[PDB]
């Protein structure tokens, strides 16, 4: 069976180490986007990964609201 959207999400961000803590706190990706810097301080995420998580959350919230044009990413 597939990874949850939360898992793929953290995986993409090098944040996979937090999947076991997010699950113990019953944080799906739905709940994750409802989290503030202070929410993530409460579960003892340190400043570095807090910034990376919230950066990723905010990029996602924005493009879901304003997709813009289709773009070609050269790899």
């Amino acid at each position: 069976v597939d990874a949850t959207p939360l898992e793929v999400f953290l995986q993409s961000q090098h944040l996979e180490e937090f999947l076991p803590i997010f699950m113990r706190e019953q944080i799906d990706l739905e709940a994750l986007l409802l989290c503030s810097d202070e929410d993530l301080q409460n579960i003892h995420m340190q400043l570095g990964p807090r910034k990376k998580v919230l950066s990723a959350i905010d990029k996602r919230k924005q493009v879901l609201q304003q997709p813009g044009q289709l773009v070609d990413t050269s790899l």
Binding site: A3, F9, S12, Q13, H14, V63, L64, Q69, D72, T73
Partner: protein, 189 residues
């Protein structure tokens, strides 16, 4: 057993095409071909209605009715409708992966190879323009925004890619525009 074919086809048409005017067009299309027996025109007419990935299975539904004498030119003219999944491993080569990629969750469409540098690593391994990248590093990408997928591709030294050949490219050329689709041979320009 002919009425079985007609029924099956008529409901797969009803389910995959909303507007009655496009249905009417589709049936007129095949009916014209049934009089002309010109198969190049039939596929050329079919593509203006089967314009999006959800409708592509109608090329296979139409297909058993094609005479064998036209069967192979039908295949030359259709996108490859094989559902098989090609899996691939690409390495971080001085010219890189050698592909360009568009789509993602924020657009409500999958992630497609839009450009393939001839002779590069992606072409070495047999990826093609018009493949939908279904999986990366073993993960389904259906919930990933475009930038998330690019991130996921860049996480490790190599990247596992499994594609399903679609044959269409998503086009929306700025935010105002509704997303639509084009066949590969046209999109290149």
């Amino acid at each position: 057993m002919d009425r079985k074919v007609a029924r099956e086809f008529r409901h797969k048409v009803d389910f995959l095409i909303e507007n009655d005017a496009e249905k009417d067009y589709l049936y007129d299309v095949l009916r014209m071909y049934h009089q002309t027996m010109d198969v190049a025109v039939l596929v050329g007419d079919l593509k203006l209605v089967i314009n999006e990935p959800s409708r592509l299975p109608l090329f296979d539904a139409i297909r058993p009715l094609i005479p064998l004498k036209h069967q192979v030119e039908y295949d030359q003219l259709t996108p490859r409708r094989s559902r098989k999944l090609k899996e691939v491993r690409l390495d971080r080569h001085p010219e890189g992966l050698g592909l360009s990629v568009r789509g993602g969750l924020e657009f409500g469409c999958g992630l497609f190879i839009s450009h393939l540098i001839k002779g590069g690593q992606a072409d070495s391994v047999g990826l093609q323009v018009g493949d939908e990248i279904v999986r990366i590093n073993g993960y389904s990408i259906s919930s990933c925004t475009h930038e998330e997928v690019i991130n996921l591709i860049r996480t490790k030294k190599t990247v596992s890619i499994k594609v399903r050949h679609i044959g269409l490219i998503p086009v929306k050329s700025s935010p105002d525009e509704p997303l639509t689709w084009q066949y590969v041979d046209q999109f290149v320009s």
